[PDB]
Structure formats: structure tokens, C-alpha cells
Design brief:
The structure is cut from a larger assembly and holds 1 copy of chain A (193 residues) and 2 copies of chain B (273 residues). With 193 residues, chain A is mainly beta. Chain A has one domain. Chain A has 2 helices and 11 strands; from the N terminus they run βββαβββαβββββ. In chain A, the strands form 3 sheets. In chain A, strands 1, 2, 5, 8 and 10 form a 5-stranded antiparallel beta sheet that branches. Chain A starts with a strand and ends in a 13-residue tail after the last strand. With 273 residues, chain B is mainly beta. Chain B has a single domain, classed as Jelly Rolls (Sandwich). In chain B, the strands form 2 sheets. In chain B, strands 1, 2, 3, 5, 9, 10 and 12 form a 7-stranded mixed beta sheet that branches. The chains are: A mainly beta (193), B mainly beta (273). At the A-C interface, loops of A face strand 10 and strand 12 of C.
Chain lengths: 193, 273, 273
């Protein structure tokens, strides 16, 4: 289980440590979207920081059920529940929460459990799956993982009004790979002296 | 003597005198774990014992009670799952909220499109009320289930005018509606006795969640989903939430319900209302 | 030696020499009633023997061939029934008509709304072609089923221009479309050899109906209903209808199709196209 980077921005490149956590704060409106990212591990994005992502670059086709674990680093007096959903391919990011309930979602509470394990099921029109990218190969798109405020993030007097959640990702027992391949990440432009 | 009386269906026998051929003309007579998952859904609601309404789990229709000749449809996975409705916000001036079932789910999901294509309807429901507050807050909610909840009006306040509730009041939808007179429940019936119906108290110093398993309660095996609303859901705070300044002022309430064992019959063209 | 070759799934064994550890590097080797009712529907189509395509009845997906972890939905009654599409009209200048499946049923009925809510798709189909004429008429039709029927263009007629068929041509809907070059089937393939695929002749002096039971034919157990069209339906008159003046000039053609053993998976939000 290695740290998945959900927060990756163009303003975080100067301070790379801000990239491992995404904030959670009290909201004025209920049902606001917090984080959304694609579930394809071998694709440019959040999944490149995962040891699974770097080992899925050496292999083209991959099939199996993944898992994405979240961890709440906030205080002990912080209470709230957030919806964590997975949308099968063919849609965009769900506009509101009423469209994100129709997928496979889990309800997870801060004040009770400090960690949640979301199991992304294997839904595919093929036994295996190649690495999806822009243009013509996007037909392998895995889905979209979203995180929604369900109730709110409630804080008492004296505790901080902000909180940070760390994302963690791994693979299940049935995850397999094949068709070994060169990797895109490493680049040698000059002789090593 | 064949029994044409009205008690024939019961398993209890009485001693009753009859001077005629019809048994209904006789006298009265002397008497002798877990991780709840609908299909793909999960909630956190804890723990252990939850309220089964009237001690019966939602089940299918027995072959003895069903007069419909056609074979009903049972979309197990696509129908029965947790549906999260719109969130509310608790305020110090708040009164209550009431939802009608199965009004809220007619516009949502596959369950909504099958209720439109099909004439009859049968299902059980699972109600989950969701509220979160810190250990410095305080308050109490009452979550009740009232079979056949009528909405009465104020008769203009003089009592001499005949007024009926509009369609928007009796068919709220997934957005619910607010009660203007919680004490009489806008039915003319007291709130103090509301706990006779299945209920759970949400007390902010004990439990943050409530769960009520509601079976299918009707005089007929199958019913129409669009016309007839079975039971209401009342969330009425008995004790107002009170918090000192500086804490979180917005305390939301979320209602996540799921159908259980839904049977549909009488396929036809799409009918909205 | 574990078999990594491409023939491992077959039940036929060959004698093949291999000098390496991988079996795919080996040599080629030497070789060794009725009254059809879907749920509630009836047709009249007669009689006795009808064409089963490739000698296989539509069935569910075996547990060995299904990689989907989720449990599929099987709305037996609401999905599988006869659906009557729009009627055509035969004319002496007519050429042909082609329908794409399951394009026609995506907008119709419960089957259409489930294909929108669900990602994957599997079903078998039952095609019924309907044509009526008196004993004084004459003519012949050819009803064929072509798995993976591509639509080629004329390349502008010079052949040097690259042109692709529009979305309205490749996704006709329940209204079908007409062929501008029946001889090449607009695929570049002859009409004379069209009977290699499952076919039935409708001859006005013999039979007024045609029925083709089509199984699910794809390289994958489940497929997407919106993107991928499985097979086409071609009704091309080989012999033009000819009738003397005074008879009925309008001879309609009706296509009534039904799905068989439809499984849906991957529930999601509504997606039109």
C-alpha cells in the first residue's frame, strides 16, 4: 500500500510535499465535490506515484480489481461522513451527488473509522485491459473515482477547521499483468559520467 | 357449514352460536455482522441492534396472496441499493421534515423508470437517517414511520372553510417538505404519541445514525406507485440543538433509503403522473 | 510443459514438434408447438422449422467466460418481448433496407432504459420479418444477418477521396435506412454470396413470414450497447414485386424483433450517446 497523490497541481510543483494530501474543510453548501481522478493505474496522473503504477509501466496489459484506501489525519474531535464513489466508463465527472450515488459507493465516517478500503471492481468488456490514454486508446478507460461531502465536516471550539486526507492504493489478490514492455518515465539524454 | 365470516383467515377459533346458515350473522362469541450492502453500496451506521418495523423482514409476495396472473419482474441488483437523497440543514428555528414513499425514488435511477413502465408495485424499504455533530453539541431527533400519513390543513383558521392540501404538499419528492405545526403533525394527532409507530431517537451524545427496516404494509398485495403513497418519514427535533459561538453552525441531515424485494407487474407505456 | 499456444482452448490435439519452452513457437503440425410467446406477446408466423443461426440457442453467459466481478441483472419479463418497429413500404424502384442491432431498441421500452443505465450488454435476438400480398402478386425477398457489418462509402466516385459514413448512416435507429448500392451491399461485397450468412427467402407464392434466431456473437462475453453494433439486418428484394393494375399498390414490410436472455452489468448514471 503506497501513497497515491490525489492533489497534483501546477501550483504545487514548487513545494512537492503538498502533493501527498488534499484538504477537507467545513462547507457552506452541502454536497460539494472534493476530489475526482481516473482509476486507470497505467495512465499519466495520480497513479504515477504508486509502486503499482511504476510496475504497470513495464507491462502493457493488466487485469484485476484494485483498492484505494483513504486515511484521515485530522483531529480526534472532528466528525463527519463523506461519500466515496466509483463510476463505470462512459460518463464524465458526475455533476452533482445525485448522479454519483448510482455507481458503486461507500459511506465512511471520520469519528469512528480512521481508514476506509474502497474496492474498485473489475468491470470490463475484455478479459485484459491495456493502458488507456488520449485519443484512440481511451476505449480502455477504467472509470472515475470521486469523493463527496455527504453531511459536512463538523469541528468544535478549539479544534482546527481544516483537515488533510492521505490517499493510499494497492492491488488485490487477482491482479495480473502481461506483455512486458519498456517504460516511458526514465529518460537518458546524455552519457552518465 | 362453510365459513363466510370475516374471522375465517385467523388461526384462532372461537365458541359462537349461530341460528342461520351464514356464519357472519353469528354472535361475537367468547375468546380463547454486518457491513450492510444492498447490492453495491456501503454505509457506516453502527451498531448491532437496529429496528425492524413490526418484527417482519421485507420479503416477496406469497403465492396465496397474489391475484395477478402475470409474472412479476424482480430486478434484484439494479433496484435494491442505497439511494442518497438531498441533504437538509438544521437550524435553531427548525420544525421538521416529512418525506413520502415511494414518492422520492420515482424520478431516480432504474427504480424510477420501472415504476413508470409498470402499473402495480410492491417493495420493502430501508431508511437510514444521517446526522453528525461534535461532542460539544446537544440535541435530539425523532425518526418515525407512519403508515398512511394524511396531510390535514388548518381550514383557514376559522374552521368553517374547506381546504385541501395541494399536489406539491402531498407529493413532495426527493426534496421533502417542512411541517408548519409539528405538535399536531399537521394531521391533528399529537407528537407525544408519535412513538407508537416504529421510531428511533437520534441523540447527539450517543448515536449519530438511525436505521428502520420497513416491510410492505398495505391492504392489497400490489399497489400503484404513482397514485398511492404508503408511509411517511418524520424527522422532528424534540430538543433543539444548542451550541456555543465558535462551533460549526451548519449541521446537515442526510436520508439514504434503499428498497428491498421490489416486484413490478403490469408492463405498459411510460406514465409520468 | 504448460501450453501457452493459441490452440489450447480447442478440444482437438495435434502432433507438433517444439525445440523451445514456449508452445506457440512450435510448428503447425499434422491434423487429426409452438405459439411463440416471449413473455406476453404472440405472432402468427408459420410454420414448424425456423432458422436457428449457427445452430445455437441464445443462452446466458457461462461462469468460465465471464470476467466481470459484479452480478449481472436479468429482467426476464420486462426485457424479452416482441417489439414491433416502424413499417416500410415496398416500391418498384425500391432497393433495400438495413437495421443495426441493438441500435433500434435503445430508445424503446425498459430494454432501452436499462442499456442507458448499464455499461456492459449481452443478449440474443429473435428477428421476425412480416410481409403480406395476395395470390396475384409475385416477388422475393432475402433476409440476412451479417455479424459486424461495416458501411463503406463510394470514395467520391474517383476513388482518391477519403470519406467516412456519417453518424446517421451508421446509427440509423428504429427507422432503418436504404441502400444506395445493393449489389455491393455498400460494403464492397457481393449480394450473390450474401446467403453464406444466415438467411431466409420470403417468396410471395409460398411464405409470408421469416424468422431467424440469432445468438450473441462477439469476441468478448459482454459488450457496450451504445458504442458497438453487433450485426446488421438486410432485407433486399432479389425479384421485384410486379402486380397488374387494380390490385393493392402498397405492400408493407414490418420488422418485429425480441431480445432473448439479456444480461446487464456496470450500473451507472444515464448516458444517452
Amino acid at each position: 500500500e503506497t501513497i497515491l497523490e490525489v492533489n497534483n497541481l501546477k501550483t504545487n510543483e514548487t513545494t512537492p510535499m503538498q502533493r501527498l494530501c488534499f484538504p477537507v474543510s467545513v462547507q457552506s453548501k452541502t454536497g460539494e465535490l472534493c476530489a475526482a481522478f481516473r482509476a486507470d493505474p497505467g495512465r499519466d496522473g495520480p497513479w504515477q506515484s504508486t509502486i503499482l503504477g511504476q510496475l504497470c509501466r513495464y507491462y502493457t496489459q493488466w487485469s484485476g480489481s484494485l483498492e484505494v484506501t483513504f486515511m484521515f489525519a485530522g483531529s480526534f474531535m472532528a466528525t463527519g461522513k463523506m461519500l466515496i464513489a466509483y463510476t463505470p466508463p462512459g460518463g464524465s465527472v458526475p455533476a452533482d451527488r445525485i448522479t454519483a450515488m448510482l455507481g458503486t459507493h461507500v459511506i465512511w465516517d471520520f469519528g469512528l473509522q480512521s481508514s476506509v478500503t474502497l474496492v474498485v471492481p473489475w468491470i470490463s468488456n475484455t478479459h485484459y485491459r491495456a493502458h488507456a490514454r488520449a485519443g484512440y486508446f481511451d476505449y480502455y478507460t477504467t472509470g472515475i473515482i470521486t469523493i463527496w461531502y455527504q453531511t459536512n465536516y463538523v469541528v468544535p471550539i478549539g479544534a482546527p477547521t481544516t483537515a488533510y486526507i492521505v490517499a493510499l492504493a494497492a492491488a488485490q489478490d487477482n491482479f495480473t499483468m502481461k506483455l512486458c514492455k519498456d517504460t516511458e518515465d526514465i529518460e537518458q539524454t546524455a552519457n552518465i559520467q | 357449514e362453510n365459513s363466510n365470516s370475516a374471522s375465517e383467515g385467523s388461526t384462532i377459533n372461537y365458541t359462537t352460536i349461530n341460528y342461520y346458515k351464514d356464519a357472519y350473522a353469528a354472535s361475537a362469541g367468547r375468546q380463547d455482522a454486518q457491513l450492510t450492502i444492498g447490492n453495491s453500496t456501503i454505509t457506516t451506521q453502527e451498531a448491532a441492534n437496529i429496528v425492524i418495523a413490526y418484527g417482519e423482514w421485507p420479503e416477496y409476495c406469497p403465492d396465496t396472496d397474489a391475484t395477478a396472473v402475470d409474472k412479476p419482474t424482480r430486478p434484484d441488483v439494479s433496484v435494491n441499493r442505497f439511494f442518497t437523497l438531498d441533504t437538509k440543514s438544521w437550524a435553531k428555528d427548525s420544525k421538521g421534515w416529512y418525506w413520502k414513499f415511494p414518492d422520492v425514488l420515482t424520478e431516480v435511477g432504474v427504480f424510477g423508470q420501472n415504476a413508470q413502465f409498470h402499473y402495480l408495485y410492491r417493495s420493502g424499504f430501508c431508511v437510514h437517517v444521517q446526522c453528525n455533530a461534535s461532542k460539544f453539541h446537544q440535541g435530539a431527533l425523532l425518526v418515525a414511520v407512519l403508515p398512511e400519513y394524511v396531510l390535514g390543513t388548518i381550514a383557514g383558521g376559522t374552521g368553517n372553510e374547506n381546504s385541501h392540501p395541494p399536489y406539491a404538499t402531498t407529493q413532495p419528492g426527493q426534496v421533502g417538505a417542512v411541517l408548519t405545526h409539528p405538535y399536531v403533525l399537521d394531521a391533528g394527532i399529537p407528537l407525544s404519541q408519535l412513538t407508537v409507530c416504529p421510531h428511533q431517537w437520534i441523540n447527539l451524545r450517543t448515536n449519530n445514525c438511525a436505521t428502520i427496516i420497513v416491510p410492505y404494509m398495505n391492504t392489497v398485495p400490489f399497489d400503484s406507485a404513482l397514485n398511492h403513497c404508503n408511509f411517511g418519514l418524520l424527522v422532528i427535533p424534540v430538543v433543539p440543538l444548542d451550541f456555543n459561538a465558535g462551533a460549526t453552525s451548519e449541521i446537515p441531515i442526510t436520508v439514504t433509503i434503499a428498497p428491498m424485494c421490489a416486484e413490478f407487474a403490469g408492463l405498459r407505456q411510460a406514465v409520468k403522473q
